Amino acid sequence: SGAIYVGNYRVVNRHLATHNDWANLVWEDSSRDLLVSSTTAQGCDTIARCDCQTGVYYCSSRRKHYPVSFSKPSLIFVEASEYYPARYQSHLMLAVGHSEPGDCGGILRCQHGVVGIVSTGGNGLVGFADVRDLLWLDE
Ligand SMILES: COc1ccc(Cl)cc1OC(=O)N1CCC[C@H](C(N)=O)C1
Ligand SMILES: [Zn+2]
After folding, report:
1. Which of these, 91, 71, 103, 96, lies nearest to 131 by C-alpha position?
2. Closest Cα to atom 9 of ligand 1
3. 89 near 71, Cβ under 8 Å?
4. Sheet containing 34-44: which strands, arranged edge to edge?
């Protein structure tokens, strides 16, 4: 679990969005595993606007943060789960690091701000849905 709170927006994994997220829907994209809903309270998380390929993510299945080197956002094939059929997920960044399904939502940050959230993983890999291209999150 986990979310990003920026301005009047909440960014979560689409497959973990709640009934309230869908009732306050701003934008969603199944191919990215992202959903953004509106909030009444102001968030003040900062979104990175950069080309970093290193950062630190939070891993809830270890209660720890780990440093990572990750690939640039790209189209990656993700095997079927209970949430989606087998498909290409876009804007996904992969790195070597521990993850389990419930780690989805953990934040990846660089020195400039939030980069993205855990969205995929397995066998010593962890994948992050990028949010740095969503320029409207700041207005
Ligand atoms: C962090 O996720 C995992 C980590 C390890 C393992 Cl063995 C499996 C993990 O589950 C996943 O990769 N998915 C399940 C939920 C939906 C995901 C998606 N974005 O399509 C894919
Ligand atoms: Zn950065």
Report:
1. 91
2. 101
3. no
4. 4-13, 34-44, 25-29
Residue to mutate (ligand 1; options 66, 84, 99, 126; most atoms within 8 A of CB): 99
Specify the residue for token string 């790209």. 74
* Beta-ladder partners of 96: 125
Method in brief? X-ray
Please report the resolution in angstroms: 1.2
Nearest CA to ligand 1 atom 21: 120
Q: Which residue has the tokens 């080309």?
A: 51
* Pair of tokens at residue 24: 């306050």
- Other Cβ atoms less than 10 A from the Cβ of 29: the count is 15
Helix (H, G, I), strand (E, B) or coil at 137: helix
